[model samples]
Target: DDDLVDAEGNLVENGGTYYLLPHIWAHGGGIETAKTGNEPCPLTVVRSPNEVSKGEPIRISSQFLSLFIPRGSLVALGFANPPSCAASPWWTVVDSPQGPAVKLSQQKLPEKDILVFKFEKVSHSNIHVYKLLYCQHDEEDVKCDQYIGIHRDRNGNRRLVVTEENPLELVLLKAKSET
Candidate 1:
C-alpha cells in the first residue's frame, strides 16, 4: 500500500524508528556577570501555579534562586519595580492569555541577615510568572543583561531555558540530589 515504502521506494508501515532525542544545556548568570560594579543587573523571573493559593507568600528555599542565577552570586528576590512609563508591577489576570512577560514591584529581598520588603496580595488570580530585572552598576551608571526566557516543559517535567539556542534541560536535574 501507499503507507509502506522500503528498500527501493517500496511502501512500508514501519519505515524507520522514531526517537525522542533529549538534550541538556547549562544556564544561569555566573558571579562574573553578577559583577554589579561593571555589568547591568540581569532580569530574572519565576512562576507558580494558581492552586498555589497564596500570593507572593511562598518562602524561597536556600537553593531556589540558585536555579536561575549562579550559586555564590548575590541573588535578590522581589517584585519588579517598573518605571513610571511602564505598567504596574503587580500580577493581573484577564479573560485571555497574554505574552509571557510580567511586571514586579516592591521587591522583598534579604539584606545582610534580615528579610527585606513585605508583599501584599496583588490579586486573587493565579501567579503565572515572576519577572526580575538585574542591572550591573558601574561608577554611577547601569546596564542591563539581555538574557530572557521561560521554563521549558517535557512530559510534565520542567527545565530552564536560558537561551533560544542552548536549552539546558539537565541544569536542574541535580534538584533531587541537592535536597
Candidate 2:
C-alpha cells in the first residue's frame, strides 16, 4: 500500500541508495541589497604541484569589485558537488572568496573581480555549492539573501530567524529498500 514505485515502476524489489539532501533556504528581504554589477569570476591559478600534480601553485585572489554596502559580519564560503562523488569528479576549495586570511586583511582587493580559483585538470564535470554569507541593515527583509541579521525591538534587539529547504535527488539499485 505504498505510493512509491520501483525504478521500473513494477513490483520489482525496491532497493537503492540516496545521498544527503541539501537544504535550500531562502533569505528574506531584511538586509543590504546585493551588488548591482557583474564581472568575470576567474577560476585558475598557477601553483607548485605535489602528489596530485606538479607545477606552479595557482594563486587565487578575491574579486571584491561589486558595489556592496559594507557591514560588519562573518561570511563563510562553501562548495558543493552537485553530481556527487560517485558519478562526477572531486574538487577542493583551494582559495576562498576572501583569500588568505592574512592577505585579506592587508591587501586591497581588486574592484572588478569578486572571487577566483585554479583547477587541476579541466573536466566537463564541475562541483557546485552555495557560496557566501551576507549581512545588511536592520529594517529590510532578508528572505532572498544568505545573510545574518540583527533587529532592534521596542525593548531590545534580536537575531533574525533562518530556515532551510532540502533538495531531493536519488539513484538506487534493487534490494536496499525492504527490511
Candidate 3:
C-alpha cells in the first residue's frame, strides 16, 4: 500500500493538491538544495577604465579582505585584471565530464598574482560567490612561516585561511586606465 507522511513521519497530505511522501521525512523539514543565486561580480572595479593602456595593472579589491589566490595555482573561471565589457577575462569554456567548466592560464613565475574568479549562472537567484584553491609547485613541501595551506570546516567546505604567523594576502593597487 502506498502511504504519505510529513517530516514527523505522521501520515499527512493536503487533499489532492500535494502529498508528502515518506521519503521526504528523511530530510527533516527542509531538504538540502544547491545554491541558487546570481550575485553581482564582487570583484568589479569601482569605476570603468577610460585612459588606461593595455597591459597596465589595475586595482582589484574584495570585501572579504582575507581572500587571496596563491601564485602558480590554477583557478576556474579565472580572469585577469582590467576587465571590460567588450573583452572579458582571458579564458575558455569547455564541457567537462561533470559539466561545463572554465580553464585559466597557469602561472609560471613565483610572484603572487591576483586571480579574479566568477562562476557561471545556472540559477535565477541573484547571489554569486567565489572560491580559491592553492596549487603547490615546489618539489618538497616548502614551509613558509608566512604562507599557510587550505583549511576545512565541519561542513566539509575548504577555504584558504591566512594568519599573522603566515600572512600571504595579494594586495595590488596601481592607478591606470584602459586605452
Candidate 4:
C-alpha cells in the first residue's frame, strides 16, 4: 500500500479531484476542456483517480514532491466529463509522426497486451516532480517503456504527447465539491 500526494506536498489518502498545473514557472496555465465537437482534451496531470487499483508499490527515486504512487497504477490524465466529445478519461499513447500521441476513448486500456502504467519520481529537478509512463512486456523479450510529455502546436494549442524530454510535471490541485 502506498499514499499519493499533491503539488503542495501533502498526503492523498482517498482519491479526490485535482487540477494538473503545467509550465509551473514560465506559464502558470493548466489544462481545460476541448469540447470542439469530436475533439480531444489532452492534459498534463490534471486530476485523478490517480491511484489505479493498488498493486505493487512503485519506486520513489527522488525524495522531493512528497507524492508517491503504487506500481501498476494507471495515470488517468483528466476529468472525464465527455458530454458530446465522447472521450474516455483514461489517456493512452498512440503512434504518430510528431509524437506518440495521447488520446482517450470510450474503450478500456489494451490490458489484453502486456501493460503497466506507473508514476515515476524522476530526479534532478527544482520542484522534485513525478512523471507518467507506461511499461509493456513482449512474450519472450518482455520490456517496453515510453514517457508522456506535452507538445505545443503552432496554433497555440497544447497537447500532451509522448517524448523522453519534458516529461510533464504533475500534481493534483483540489477539485470542487461534489454535485
Which candidate tops lDDT? 4
Q: Kindly report which residue pairs in candidate 4 clash with one another.
A: 20-46, 58-71, 138-142
Clashes in each model (backbone N, CA, C under 3 Å)?
Answer: 22, 36, 10, 3
Q: Report the C-alpha lDDT of model 3 over 1-179, residue by residue, as the tens digit.
A: 22222223333221111111112122121101111123122222111112221223322222133334222223322233423331433332223343322222222322222232321112332222112233233454422222322233344422233323332122122222323
Residue by residue across 1-179, what tens digits does model 2's lDDT show? 32222223332121122111111222211111111113122122111112222111111112232222122212221112111211211112222353221011112233221222211111242322222233222364222233212222243322122212321111111222211
In the range 33-119, model 1's lDDT, one tens digit per residue, is 011111133222232222221122212222223222222222322222323322332221111132232222224322421111111
Give the poorly placed runs of model 4, Cα more than 4 Å off. 13-15, 33-72, 78-80, 106-116, 124-128, 136-144
- In angstroms, give how far residue 74 of model 2 lies from its true place: 39
In angstroms, give how far residue 104 of model 4 lies from its true place. 1.9
Candidate 2 TM-score over all chains jointly: 0.14
Per-residue CA lDDT of model 4 for 14-87, tens digit only, reads: 33455555424444455443322234533322222213311111122222232444434544343434323334
Name the 10 consecutive residues with the lowest summed lDDT in model 1.
Answer: 170-179
lDDT of each: 0.23, 0.21, 0.25, 0.46
